[PDB]
DNA sequence: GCTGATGCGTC
DNA sequence: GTCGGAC
DNA sequence: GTCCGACGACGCATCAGC
């Protein structure tokens with residue numbers, strides 16, 4: 001009898017059946033999800049968020065098992081497994097057109113309001129079909145993403161409008177945020193997985209209705225309960241890190257339970273897995289302090305793109321990105337190369353490599369920017385213009401055996417013994433086994449001279465497995481720009497401000513920076529900036545720059561194609577900014593004509609360091625200096 | 636038949 | 647990709 | 654240290670507008 005508007009999955013003593021706002025077998029109302037979202041947004045401790053989400057999931061499992069998968073994807077704001085490549089194709093512009101049409105308002109009015117609040121949901125809401133359902137809403141999202149071709153944008157808009165007109169209470173707020181790609185729950189993959197393992201542990205699936213067991217933790221002590229949930233949570237996590245595909249896991253989970261999940265879902269070539277990531281380290285001394293006694297290896301950190309290469313029993317090859325996207329069609333040249341890299345005894349494998357752009361005439365690595373000019377789907381290897389060289393650094397699976405639980409020392413040994421190097425095509429990452437601080441510093445200096453970002457550091461025997469659920473950032477990355485006094489540092493003028501969104505709402509979220517062109521006495525936009533400040537520094541900058549707002553830009557400020565700032569600023573503040581490198585920009589005018597007739601120069605991964613109170617705009621980094629720095633790069 | 640805006644992936 | 651904040 | 658969501662440049666692919 002409970003109207004979903006009153007649904008409260010944050011209550012104490014939540015009963016999956018009696019406290020749900022729908023009847024057994026009935027479709028999960030979307031308003032039940034939105035209310036769950038509200039209660040999750042009301043808190044900042046993940047543990048409380050997880051329990052609240054787990055309560056909804058327990059009711060879904062008890063009452064409407066078929067809706068579990070759509071409710072999960074709604075909670076994650078995803079459309080499906082990443083390797084299927086479903087994409088909404090809906091941005092803010094298209095979303096605001098849908099809001100405008102659905103609210104009888106004008107586009108510019110809706111546009112201004114959304115920019116001020118930094119949230120599209122509030123506008124869409126504050127503006128008879130049957131109640132929306134979770135799977136219903138989820139299905140309409142997938143219909144939107146499957147619309148393709150000419151006039152498809154108008155059809156996507158019709159669907160979005162139909163959703164909004166059926167919205168009630170806070171539904172529209174969350175419809176708009178999901179389509180916007182900014183749900184802002186504070187809860188994502190890891191917390192949703194914890195909520196799921198907690199839900200199916202407390203309220204097991206597959207019981208005869210009404211379920212006899214609704215809270216399997218009641219009979220345990222608080223301590224035993226916590227230990228039990230951590231263990232069950234790890235079972236799900238380690239399975240997910242090997243098979244990050246809910247389409248595969250949920251049917252098994254509902255049919256055989258969590259404790260038997262690894263028997264049915266396990267690492268297999270052809271199914272992407274979560275890759276090992278790296279923790280940034282600010283110097284060699286921090287590396288030694290972090291690994292203390294453990295022996296470790298250093299490897300070049302190549303500046304390319306991650307390629308997880310799967311060879312299946314039978315010969316089929318698949319290649320996946322860091323985010324489990326399917327890149328098989330992008331690398332036909334690599335697929336034809338597989339026979340050359342493996343010994344004939346190798347019948348299957350999963351390799352961890354970096355794909356790097358490679359100049360075959362000069363036999364040299366090329367920058368990342370050249371690698372990105374490859375087409376996303378190339379059918380003919382003969383049409384490839386940017387060759388790649390594979391730098392292999394790990395082996396995760398070999399000849400039917402998962403190596404996830406073996407230490408790096410053995411995974412690397414098997415890689416070196418079972419695979420074959422070919423210059424410019426497939427080689428092992430340059431490496432050095434040492435604990436001598438001078439040798440490491442010399443090795444770091446060489447990696448940069450050899451066209452790399454720095455070093456990867458990895459333990460060989462102690463905590464050296466490939467178990468992402470135990471530690472996802474088990475590796476250390478020591479980049480040149482992490483070091484103090486090293487890396488490109490510039491003093492740039494603040495010429496504009498952009499209204500913040502989400503956590504930055506009611507504030508400036510980013511800024512437009514410029515270098516000083518001496519020859520024309522103009523300030524030339526060079527990049528935007530939006531990270532590196534504390535919340536306090538960012539608030540101070542909102543107040544100090546608010547005074548400098550102008551209705552129109554100064555005549556000596558050139559931005560060309562850059563995003564026009566929401567608020568123009570009188571060139572006064574000069575900020576010190578660090579970046580990983582300089583790039584040739586297709587939009588930014590800074591230093592155009594000094595290194596390239598058509599293109600200016602921008603900053604790769606800029607971040608705020610500190611205000612330079614001792615510098616006026618005329619003494620900022622000059623466009624000539626920017627060009628000089630960029631030339632030092634490509635020597 | 637072409638061009639520019641832009642979604643969304645890479646880092 | 648870099649970064650800061652709450653836990 | 655984990656987890657999450659603020660924010661960056663830049664490219665191909667796609668599609669609206671012409």
Ligand SMILES: *OP(=O)(O)OC[C@H]1O[C@@H](n2cnc3c(N)ncnc32)[C@H](O)[C@@H]1O
Nearest residue numbers: 278299300301302305306354393429456
């Ligand atoms: O900065 P980040 O955390 O994305 O760095 C990790 C990425 O670095 C790339 N990479 C390049 N070379 C290596 C080696 N030798 N070992 C491990 N990772 C490496 C990868 O693309 C990785 O995701």
